[PDB]
Write a protein that binds this ligand. Structure first.
Ligand code: SF4
Ligand code: MG
Ligand code: ZN
Ligand code: ZN
Ligand code: ZN
Lengths: 512, 513, 124, 146, 57, 103, 189, 97
């Protein structure tokens, strides 16, 4: 995971600073370490180690346990640092499913890490004031009504809570309070009667104290997997079948695990009732749809039942295998061309094959077939087998069977995606560093135009910035801005490949 | 205008942290990329090519042609490296016994190490104590490989991990799909029936599909070793500051400079092996386009691995019979080991000059701290006496006597000039008038120079002492017979070595101690 | 060689003038030996640096001139590097103190700029 | 090989016919099960169509289009469904029938190939300070330009 | 393993060509030059602390 | 010249068409046939591009960003105090944090 | 534009100079070694200022010369960013106006920082500037080099060393601006 | 070289080195086994530990850490034979005093 350590170094250096990313990188790299050896093996002062560990544990980036003799051994989560990259997709999906208030709630959560309900609704009511005008203030109640709608839908959950020390070992305090996660009060919101209005930033005792809220990222990953399978069905069969699949996943939302090989079975009688009322459909056509999606060899659905008429399940691991296989063939198609993607799908479906068989099946000649075979061997997409005749394992006396294994190639593709995003972040930071002088000069001139713009802004000063020598390099500023915008957009859009690969590698594992 | 460069910093060397380079630091070390295969050009000029081996941007190996971006010579140039880009990765024949061990300790699927969290917490804490030596790390690697080889299932991904063992010269096999006489597991049952299209168009697959397992080639173990998390690397007992697990598979290869492989030995064996590695790289790069079979590709790849393995070590055991060398060549190990290698041959005891060897014969008329050096040896052995104020008038006479009369000199060196004017030619009375303070005159060995004196099987520390020499006409070293008891000399044709120290600190330490 | 401090103190050009003047006072009693090109480098850089400084307005100055100059200039809310340039260049008009002082038209009023010109011309 | 310059027109023409039939069946929109049954095209009807087009002088045998349609499937552009031959015009397969329908790919092209890092041929030689560095690449300088 | 080997021992001091610690290498010699440690400093005229109270509040 | 390995064990039973001797090393950046697929745009995909830039400009001003101090600065400038921004300091919940976190 | 730089160094005092007091010999040997050379990250050393601490004089084995570790300070031409200088013009170029500063030679003015009403030559060497009322397009930067006044806005360090196997660009390049009002030649303001 | 017919010169064996250790003659042993056999100046970079040339480390691309260092030629030959084998010796130089 050297690519993961490099990417986590870049993300911590961007979103927290330098003398915190040293601590984060060391905790990712070596592992469980007590507090004094984080100080000694890095070389920084102890107070900076304390501030860095507190700002990491605030955002739920490092965990801590209690061990023998009373030591506190910290430990960073590499996956939680990597999920800092998907924050604009989280803020966009909460703006999609909800209002701007639900956008700003998840924004304040992902930015502060842990907040109470009162603090986050105060900050949302404060920040909605700039979005409004003409005397209308935002109030706490309608923000809280969206906050409880998020808490009901489980996008937002409560942090693991402190134990009651009057009931749990009264006496001397332990070195660490030993937080425990309670399954009960995750989504039980504390009631609030305190209402108020947001300040307009003029520049001229807490009931839910200790109850902190964090964004539940696993629910966002479940919603993203839902949208992935829904768009897969929407691109294969039809829009109505896609809406039926969306309805089945919506009914499968609150009733199953985020990591389960098969979800709850659904009776078609309640699939019919759960559809939004805009569709003119019958029971029999719905039965046809379900039994023709069960006819699919991609098998997104399974029968798994006979009682109650139409009993239907949706598949999770087979659907994620189909999506990961589509990603793995899409990258081969775009890297080598269509005639090589043909060979990749051929070696995929026929599970084992030889060269003459590829040349016969694929309608691709010699010196162009084997060329693409060997290019895909040099990139770890396609494994050999070498069934041996003798135990000498000599190449002269054996048969070589091409083989595509989806798991190792998906891990390889994930390893390439991490290093890809790391390289894009490198290029963005290099361009900003080499043009920071013109950047700060532009900051100066926009601070000049910004000051007294509302009052007494003569038109002559607008020409005096254009008369200034920044105007030959406004071409360079536009080039820098479009380059930074394209690199940030690509840094966003590689995460769609990362999530579809990471879901498959996550679901093929048992953790026993 | 001119950049401040000075290096007379006078640090001494302290300790030598061994390690290994990644393939992408070899690119940062080397100067040229060796891609060509012919040594010298075609014509009569006999000059080497521009991007092959024997390129003189890798230093020089002859007095004629200097190092080709400066104008300074063979005697000063360290030599410089070039790198060969291998087309397909190969195992290193030295690190292969460690590649097997790393593969036996980690999961072959998710690339974590197969241990419980508690045993990792045990061994990582045992790696924290001070005073951890190399004996202790050698024990701890076996104690962790034992608890890794007793597990068959992964505690992290859940997949199965069979035994990994060496199945010959530079091949690694992994038994993932072992069978039993019991109820067949699903994970082996799917793999046994996955051979459908191979069974359809071939007959002999069907008996041989029981012996099929996972073949680990460098294309796969280089892929695996890139995914080992850096938390799990010290449990493989590697210091991650001195090496990485990805570095044990070579995919780029340094070539030694010309001062390590002399072009007139014609060419050294390492130059031939590097030429053959470049040739096999071109052969595979052409057969990836010309559509040769997998038999020819894998055979050539095996050759690429066998040539690198013979490049590093030319005494392998399990060499296949159609691929062995015809002649015996010095690899790097065979120019390290042996009786005439680097260590035992050149580091431990090395030959010295300013020495002599003559038969001894007795002479009691000398004092006990004098040895009588013959004239025909004292005209050859010289001591460099720097000119100063006390002995200018002595060294003018010893320059005027030349190299043939005995109290004379053989050379002369100017102050800030390192060239030695040999003192036979030139009107020597002109060179005797041009002596400045600080010139170095290599005078003959005269009466009173400290010289060392040694009988060859050196039992105790008085087998080598220092006498004050005196020159005498006959051809034997003549010392007093009272000194025969330390040397255990016997005057029956015995020879005793002479050593003349060349530095005033060496004279004084010899004379006092 | 090793640098403990790349920027330890700023220097007026009068200190460097006095340094090269005192270096000239004890030099050239024993000529170069042609044993190294170090004396050639020292002679050229000392000579040419003193020849450049000898056409600057840092000649005819003294220690106590700089003392009273910083004394009279202390009460004007200026930086170190601005007082350095004002000491070195001897400005005589107002167009160049607009250059040597950053945000001249925003910190310094025109009467303060004229008082600054008078303060500079009154001492040097 | 039969010919590599010749299959390049059949692999497009069969896809045009299948996409035309899927277009007509989609614009039918009467009964979606009946629409899906009308989406399946016969293995024999497509042979009768291509041989009626008559681009080659050599006669296009049915067993040859039986493998030409495999290259249509293996490019990920059509499926294949095997049913029993209860009813059939010819019955080229004894007791069974082969059907083909024009499909679309499952997902858009992935986000990895949108960045030029996903298509690099020297990807394993790129590091921060080396020769091939992201701060001085050519593929990004071409990619960031237009 | 990357095990770092010292060159404090005698035999590797003989190999690496550095003078060893036994014998006439246990101590260090100093020259008794006519020297003056901590000589008087040339005065700074411009940059002292008394003339340069900082600008920012 | 002849080799240590037999060429016949590699191939070349005719003994001709040996792979050519390369004069110049290949260039650092080989020309690729293919290009990246152009990016996805839209009214939803563009909002993430602006929100991601808002995250940098916000989190650099938040108190969680531990500033690195300025070091060995050459001169102090009046344009320097335009750069320096004082910021209020957050306080950790000491009940959730262990005891050794206290300064 | 001159700074003190506190440096430490080992000074090899040869043994024929033992008759002379050590402080004078250290100053002589450091002036023979640091003068007129560009130290990589601090600038151009003019001459020694003083010696501030002088440690003990070791004698290393194999050499009779006494080495000693010297704490000293040295004056260095290192003009900080946004600083006004005056200097002569050496010559004009298609890349810009090469400005001499007495002892120091490589101060380049780019065309993008020249004064904006004229930025181009008529395939002539000498760079020009145009004002409408007087001296239209015939004003010029004379190669005799009357004193101009510029403003350094960039400095660059390259580590000029023999790149490649062994055994002329300037290591201290300095780029200024002239485009501000009041700068340029001293004859213009 | 080796023998009398090549005008070769004698051999400080493995036993005369021991006898010179026994006297404590440090500089004589240094002079014999380095200066009168094979003297050679390398330049070792102090940061990366690799060898360089002319006060310039090609690896790091800098001149601010290299040091002059007297070394036998057999030792440099050993170090370059080891770097060719991808066993890297990284010479961490401390200091005098
Ligand atoms: S950094 Fe450059 S060379 Fe490396 S993957 Fe990206 S585009 Fe390719
Ligand atoms: Mg005898
Ligand atoms: Zn060279
Ligand atoms: Zn495990
Ligand atoms: Zn280095």
């Amino acid at each position: 995971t050297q690519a993961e350590i490099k990417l986590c170094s870049l993300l911590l250096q961007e979103h927290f600073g330098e003398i915190v990313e040293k601590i984060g990188v060391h905790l990712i790299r070596t592992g469980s370490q007590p507090l004094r050896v984080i100080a000694h093996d890095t070389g920084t002062s102890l107070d900076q180690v304390k501030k860095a560990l507190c700002v990491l544990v605030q955002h739920n980036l490092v965990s801590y346990q209690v061990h023998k003799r009373g030591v506190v051994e910290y430990e960073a989560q590499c996956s939680r640092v990597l999920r800092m990259l998907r924050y604009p997709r989280y803020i966009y999906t909460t703006k999609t499913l909800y209002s701007d208030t639900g956008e700003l709630i998840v924004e304040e959560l992902l930015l502060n890490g842990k907040l109470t309900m009162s603090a986050v609704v105060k900050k949302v009511a404060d920040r909605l004031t700039e979005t409004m005008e003409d005397g209308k203030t935002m109030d706490y109640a309608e923000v809280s009504n969206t906050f409880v709608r998020l808490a009901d839908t489980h996008f937002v959950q409560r942090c693991p809570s402190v134990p009651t020390t009057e009931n749990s070992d009264p006496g001397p305090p332990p070195p660490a309070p030993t937080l425990v996660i309670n399954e009960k009060d995750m989504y039980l919101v504390p009631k609030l009667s305190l209402i108020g209005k947001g300040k307009r930033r003029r520049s001229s005792p807490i009931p839910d104290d200790g109850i902190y809220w964090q964004a539940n990222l696993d629910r966002f990953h479940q919603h993203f997997r839902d949208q992935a399978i829904v768009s897969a069905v929407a691109n294969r069969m039809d829009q109505t079948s896609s809406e039926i699949v969306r309805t089945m996943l919506r009914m499968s939302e609150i009733t199953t695990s985020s990591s389960a090989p098969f979800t709850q079975p659904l009776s078609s009688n309640e699939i019919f009732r759960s559809l939004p009322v805009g569709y003119n459909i019958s029971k029999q056509v719905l039965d046809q749809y379900l039994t023709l999606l069960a006819d699919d060899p991609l098998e997104f659905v399974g029968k798994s039942g006979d009682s109650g008429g139409g009993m239907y399940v949706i598949n999770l691991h087979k659907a994620l295998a189909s999506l990961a296989t589509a990603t793995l063939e899409s990258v081969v198609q775009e890297r080598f061309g269509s005639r090589c993607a043909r060979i990749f799908r051929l070696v995929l479906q026929k599970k084992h094959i030889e060269q003459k068989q590829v040349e016969d099946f694929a309608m691709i000649p010699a010196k162009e077939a084997k060329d693409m075979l060997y290019k895909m061997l040099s990139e770890n997409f396609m494994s050999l087998q070498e069934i041996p005749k003798t135990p000498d394992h000599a190449p002269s006396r054996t048969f070589y069977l091409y083989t595509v294994n989806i798991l190792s190639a998906a891990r390889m593709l994930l390893h390439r995606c991490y290093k890809s995003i790391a390289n894009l972040i490198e290029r963005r930071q290099f361009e900003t560093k080499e043009n920071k002088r013109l950047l700060e000069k532009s900051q100066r001139v926009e601070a000049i135009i910004a000051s007294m713009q509302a009052t007494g802004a003569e038109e002559a000063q607008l020409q005096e910035i254009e008369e200034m020598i920044t105007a030959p390099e406004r071409q360079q500023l536009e080039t820098l801005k479009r380059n930074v915008n394209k690199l940030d957009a690509s840094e966003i859009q590689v995460d769609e490949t990362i999530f579809l690969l990471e879901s498959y590698i996550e679901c093929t594992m048992k953790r026993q | 205008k001119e950049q401040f460069r000075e290096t007379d910093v006078a640090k001494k060397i302290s300790h030598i942290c061994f390690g290994m380079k990644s393939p992408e630091e070899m690119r940062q070390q080397a100067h040229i990329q060796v891609v060509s295969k012919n040594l010298y050009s075609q014509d009569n000029q006999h000059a080497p090519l521009l991007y092959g081996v024997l390129d003189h941007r890798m230093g020089t190996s002859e007095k004629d042609r200097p190092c080709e971006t400066c104008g300074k010579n063979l005697a000063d140039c360290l030599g410089h490296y070039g790198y060969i880009d291998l087309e397909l990765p190969c195992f290193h024949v030295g690190y292969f016994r460690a590649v097997i061990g790393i593969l036996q300790m980690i999961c072959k699927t998710c690339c974590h190490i197969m241990l419980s969290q508690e045993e990792k917490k045990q061994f990582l804490d045992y790696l924290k104590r001070p005073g951890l030596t190399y004996l202790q790390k050698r024990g701890l690697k076996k104690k962790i490989s034992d608890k890794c080889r007793k597990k068959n299932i992964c505690h992290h991904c859940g997949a199965f991990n069979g035994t990994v063992k060496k199945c010959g010269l530079l091949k690694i096999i992994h038994e993932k799909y072992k069978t039993n006489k019991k109820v067949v597991d699903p994970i082996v049952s799917n793999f046994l029936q996955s051979f459908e299209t191979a069974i359809e168009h071939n007959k002999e697959v069907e008996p041989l599909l029981g012996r099929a397992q996972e073949n680990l080639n460098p294309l796969v173990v280089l892929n695996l070793f890139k995914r080992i998390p850096a938390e799990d690397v010290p449990l493989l007992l590697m210091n991650p500051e001195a090496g990485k697990p990805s570095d044990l598979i070579l995919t780029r290869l340094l070539v030694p400079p010309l001062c390590i492989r002399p072009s007139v030995v014609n060419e050294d064996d390492l130059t031939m092996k590097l030429t053959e590695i470049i040739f096999l790289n071109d052969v595979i790069k052409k057969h990836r386009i010309s559509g040769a079979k997998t038999q020819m590709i894998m055979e050539d790849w095996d050759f690429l691995q066998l040539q690198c393995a013979l490049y590093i070590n030319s005494e392998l055991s399990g060499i296949p019979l159609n691929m062995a060398p015809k002649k015996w060549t010095r690899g790097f190990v065979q120019r390290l080991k042996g009786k005439q290698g680097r260590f035992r041959g050149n580091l431990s005891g090395k030959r010295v000059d300013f020495s002599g060897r003559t038969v001894i014969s007795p002479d009691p008329n000398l004092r006990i701290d004098e040895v009588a050096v013959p004239v025909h040896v004292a005209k050859i052995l010289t001591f460099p006496e720097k000119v100063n104020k006390a002995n200018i008038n002595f060294l003018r006479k010893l320059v005027q006597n030349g190299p043939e009369v005995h109290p004379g000199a053989n050379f002369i060196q100017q102050r800030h000039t390192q060239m030695k004017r040999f003192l036979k030619y030139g009107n020597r009375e002109k060179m005797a008038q041009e002596l400045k303070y600080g010139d170095i005159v290599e005078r003959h060995l005269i009466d009173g120079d400290v010289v060392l004196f040694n009988r060859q099987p050196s039992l105790h520390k008085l087998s080598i002492m220092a006498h004050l020499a005196r020159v005498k006409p006959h051809r034997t070293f003549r010392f007093n017979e009272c000194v025969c008891t330390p040397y255990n000399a016997d005057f029956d044709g015995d020879e005793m070595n002479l050593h003349l120290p060349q530095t005033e600190e060496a004279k004084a330490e010899a004379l006092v101690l | 060689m090793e640098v403990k401090d790349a920027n330890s103190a700023l220097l007026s050009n009068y200190e460097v003038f006095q340094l090269l003047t005192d270096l000239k006072e004890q030099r050239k009693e024993s000529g170069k030996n042609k044993h190294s090109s170090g004396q050639q480098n020292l002679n050229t850089i000392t000579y040419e640096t003193l020849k450049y400084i000898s056409k600057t307005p840092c000649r005819h100055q003294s220690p106590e001139i700089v003392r009273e100059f910083l004394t009279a200039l202390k009460s004007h809310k200026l930086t170190k590097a601005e007082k350095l340039q004002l000491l070195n260049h001897r400005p005589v008009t107002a167009v160049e103190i607009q250059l040597m002082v950053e945000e001249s038209e925003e910190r310094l009023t025109e009467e303060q700029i004229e008082a600054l010109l008078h303060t500079v011309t009154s001492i040097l | 090989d039969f010919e590599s310059e010749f299959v390049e027109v059949l692999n497009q023409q069969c896809f045009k016919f299948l996409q035309s039939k899927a277009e007509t069946a989609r614009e039918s929109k009467q009964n979606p099960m009946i629409q899906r049954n009308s989406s399946f095209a016969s293995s024999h009807e497509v042979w009768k169509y291509i041989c009626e087009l008559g681009i080659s002088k050599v006669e296009l045998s049915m067993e040859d289009i039986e493998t030409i349609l495999n290259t249509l499937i293996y490019d990920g552009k059509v499926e294949m469904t095997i049913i029993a031959a209860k009813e059939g015009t010819v019955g080229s397969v004894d007791g069974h029938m082969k059907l083909y329908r024009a499909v679309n790919p499952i997902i858009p092209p992935t986000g990895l190939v949108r960045a030029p890092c996903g298509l690099c041929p020297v990807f394993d030689d790129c590091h921060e300070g080396g020769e091939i560095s992201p701060s001085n690449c050519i593929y990004m300088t071409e990619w960031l330009e237009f | 393993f990357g095990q770092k080997d010292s060159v404090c021992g005698v035999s590797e001091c003989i190999i690496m060509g550095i003078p060893m610690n036994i014998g006439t290498g246990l101590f260090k010699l100093l020259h008794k030059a006519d020297r003056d440690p901590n000589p008087p400093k040339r005065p700074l005229i411009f940059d002292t602390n008394e003339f340069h109270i900082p600008l920012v509040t | 010249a002849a080799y240590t390995f037999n060429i016949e064990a590699v191939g070349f039973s005719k003994g001709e068409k040996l792979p050519d001797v390369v004069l110049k090393p290949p260039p650092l950046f080989p020309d690729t046939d293919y290009k990246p697929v152009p990016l996805k745009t839209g009214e939803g995909e563009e909002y993430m591009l602006a929100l991601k830039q808002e995250l940098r400009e916000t989190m650099k001003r938040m108190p969680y960003f531990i500033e690195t101090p300025e070091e060995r600065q050459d001169i102090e400038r009046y344009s320097k105090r335009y750069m320096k921004v004082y910021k209020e300091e957050w306080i950790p919940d000491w009940r959730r944090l262990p005891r050794e976190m206290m300064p | 534009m001159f700074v003190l730089v506190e440096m430490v160094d080992t000074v090899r005092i040869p043994p024929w100079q033992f008759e002379r007091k050590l402080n004078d010999s250290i100053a002589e040997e450091l002036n023979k070694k640091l003068a007129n050379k560009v130290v990589y990250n601090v600038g151009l050393c003019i001459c020694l200022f003083d010696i501030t601490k002088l440690e003990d004089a070791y004698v290393f084995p194999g050499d009779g010369a006494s080495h000693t570790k010297v704490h000293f300070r040295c004056v260095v031409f290192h003009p900080f960013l946004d600083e006004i200088l005056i200097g002569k013009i050496k010559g004009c170029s298609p890349e810009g106006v090469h400005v001499s500063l007495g002892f120091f030679d490589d101060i380049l003015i780019p065309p993008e920082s020249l004064q904006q009403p004229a930025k181009f030559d008529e395939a002539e060497q000498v760079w020009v500037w145009e004002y409408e009322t007087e001296e239209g397009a015939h004003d010029l930067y004379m190669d005799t080099g009357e004193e101009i006044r510029f403003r350094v806005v960039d400095e660059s360090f390259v580590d000029t060393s023999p790149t490649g196997p062994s055994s002329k660009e300037a290591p201290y390049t300095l780029v200024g601006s002239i485009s501000e009002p009041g700068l340029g030649l001293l004859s213009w303001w | 070289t080796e023998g009398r017919s090549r005008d070769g010169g004698l051999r400080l064996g493995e036993m005369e080195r021991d006898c010179l250790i026994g006297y404590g003659a440090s500089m004589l042993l240094l002079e014999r086994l380095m200066i009168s056999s094979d003297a050679f100046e390398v330049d070792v970079c102090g940061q990366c530990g690799l060898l360089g040339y002319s006060g310039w480390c090609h690896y790091c691309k800098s001149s601010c850490h290299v040091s002059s260092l007297r070394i036998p030629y057999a030792c440099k030959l050993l170090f370059q034979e080891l770097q060719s084998m991808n066993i890297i010796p990284r010479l961490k130089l401390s200091k005098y005093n």
